[PDB]
């Protein structure tokens, strides 16, 4: 005999569907899931009904629901999200220094840092999936948020990941609509040029870890065979993230918002988060340690911001 179940892609909109006892969900819906669990080819358990299944957007209304919720047109997204969620729901999200963190697992240290950094920045997401999952993550329930970050950045559970690259995909879905940056490049020979940067690039900079240094000038190669100076004339955003490859860099109190460091090599290494509180907290998944100063291989540093305009 048949039965009635519900299908969804966003978990908010449900669609009543007659489930023929004969087939496997896959024959009837396509790829299908339960709580992350893949069940594409299986038979409907006699007490299966009244349960909500995920499915691939196999028609207009579904495709439309996914885009609205996820803000993606990638036909594989929903299936990758589910694979990840399937595993992230096995992770532990303890409070460490008054933030949600991640107990080490499956090379997820980088996601930990992303997650700890986000919680300290006033940033909002456009995609309802991100908004909601983030709201739930700040509240200690971060399985969905991780699975989504993984899916947005095209990574799978187990792989080691780069915090910066990951920020790049995420900040693509953050409200940076008002975020503006103006940079001036002066070459003593070539002359001057000025650039306005919007979106992700208004907030993210690869070249120095120091925010002061971008204000005072950083040297860069000039097509002229010389060394140019790049400095910030104007900043409009609630934060900035500064990145460099791992080098020995000193973190003092009162100078930054938060940071992470990477120890190891490109192929194989470990991230830890540092946050500046009453004193410095170094958050390493579940583990916590304090110090008044840290000098190590910092890779990404965050600073708070409102509006900045240069003298000069
Ligand atoms: C911050 C740091 C870094 C950022 C920028 C410059 C750096 C330079 C040196 C060391 C770290 C640096 N780091 C680089 C890549 C790393 C990563 O995701 N690696 C994945 C991976 C997995 C298996 C591999 C492999 C790479 O290559 C071989 O097999 C994470 C972040
Ligand atoms: Zn030049």
Residue 265 DSSP class: -
> Helices marked H in 94-156 — which ranges?
109-118, 128-137, 143-152
Helix (H, G, I), strand (E, B) or coil at 137: helix
CA angle 86, 92, 96 (to 5 degrees): 145
Query: What is the topology classification, in CATH, of domain 180-312?
Result: Jelly Rolls (2.60.120)
Q: Is the CB of 158 under 6 A from ligand 1?
A: no
Distance of alpha carbon 189 from alpha carbon 224, whole angstroms: 7
Residue 84 DSSP class: H
Annotated active-site residue in 48, 109, 146, 173:
109
Beta-carbon contacts of residue 228 (< 8 Å; ≥ 6 apart): 185, 186, 187, 190, 219, 220, 221, 222
Determine the distance separating the centroid of ligand 1 and the alpha carbon of 267, expressed in angstroms.
5
Per the annotation, the verdict on 109 as an active-site residue is: yes
268 annotated as belonging to a binding site for a ligand: no
Characterise 12 by phi-psi region: left (phi > 0), alpha (psi -120 to 50), beta (else): alpha
As its CATH architecture, domain 56-179 has Orthogonal Bundle (1.10)
Q: What is the DSSP string of 148-169?
A: HHHHHTT--TTS---HHHHHHH
Q: What is the DSSP string of 178-205?
A: T-EEEEEEEETTTEEEEEEEETHHHHEE
| Contact between 155 and 97 (Cβ < 8 Å) | no
Q: How were these coordinates obtained? A: X-ray
Beta bridge partner(s), residue 31:
none
222 annotated as belonging to a binding site for a ligand: yes
Mutate to test the pocket of ligand 1, among 242, 266, 300 (most ligand atoms within 8 A of CB): 266
Distance of alpha carbon 94 from alpha carbon 104, whole angstroms: 11
| Contact between 233 and 118 (Cβ < 8 Å) | no
| Contact between 139 and 162 (Cβ < 8 Å) | no
As its CATH architecture, domain 1-55 has Roll (3.10)
Resolution for this experimental structure (Å) = 2.6
Beta-carbon contacts of residue 260 (< 8 Å; ≥ 6 apart): 113, 117, 163, 271, 272, 273, 274, 298, 299, 300
Distance of CA 202 to the CA centre of its chain: 17
Per the annotation, the verdict on 189 as an active-site residue is: no
Residue whose entry in the numeric block shows the structure tokens 């409102």: 306
Q: Is the CB of 161 under 6 A from ligand 1?
A: yes
Q: Is the CB of 297 under 6 A from ligand 1?
A: no
Beta-carbon contacts of residue 240 (< 8 Å; ≥ 6 apart): 203, 204, 205, 211, 302, 303, 305
Residues found in the chain: 312
Q: Is the CB of 265 under 6 A from ligand 1?
A: yes
Burial of 106 (0-12, 13-18, 19+ CB in 10 A): middle
Q: Where are the domains of the chain?
A: 1-55, 56-179, 180-312
């Amino acid at each position: 005999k048949t039965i009635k179940v519900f299908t969804t892609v966003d978990n908010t909109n449900l669609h009543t569907q007659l489930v023929d006892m004969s087939m496997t969900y896959g024959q009837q819906f396509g790829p299908t899931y339960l709580d992350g669990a893949d069940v594409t080819k299986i038979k409907p358990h006699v007490n299966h009904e009244g349960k909500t299944f995920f499915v691939l957007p196999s028609d207009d209304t579904l495709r439309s629901e996914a885009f609205e919720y996820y803000h993606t047109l990638d036909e594989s997204f929903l299936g990758r999200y589910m694979s990840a969620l399937n595993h992230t729901k096995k992770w532990k999200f303890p409070q460490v220094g008054g933030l949600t963190s991640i107990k080490w697992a499956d090379n997820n240290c980088y996601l930990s840092s992303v997650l700890l950094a986000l919680q300290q920045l006033e940033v909002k997401f456009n995609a309802p999936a991100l908004q909601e999952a983030y709201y739930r993550a700040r509240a200690g329930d971060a399985a969905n948020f991780c699975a989504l970050i993984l899916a947005y950045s095209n990574k799978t559970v187990g792989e080691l990941g780069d915090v910066r690259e990951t920020m790049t995909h995420l900040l693509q879905h953050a409200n940076l609509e008002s975020a503006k940056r103006v940079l001036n490049v002066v070459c003593k020979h070539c002359g001057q040029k000025t650039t306005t940067l919007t979106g992700v690039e208004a907030v993210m900079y690869m070249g120095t870890l120091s925010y002061d240094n971008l204000k005072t000038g950083v040297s860069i190669p000039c097509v002229c065979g010389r060394d140019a100076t790049q400095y910030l004339v104007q900043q409009e955003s609630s934060f900035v993230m500064m990145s460099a490859p791992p080098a020995e860099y000193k973190l003092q109190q009162g100078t930054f918002l938060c940071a992470n460091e990477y120890t190891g090599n490109y192929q194989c290494g470990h991230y830890t988060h540092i946050t500046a509180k009453e004193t410095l907290y170094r958050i390493d998944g579940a583990h916590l340690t304090k110090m008044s100063e840290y000098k190590g291989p910092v890779t990404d540093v965050f600073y708070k911001e409102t509006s900045y305009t240069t003298t000069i």
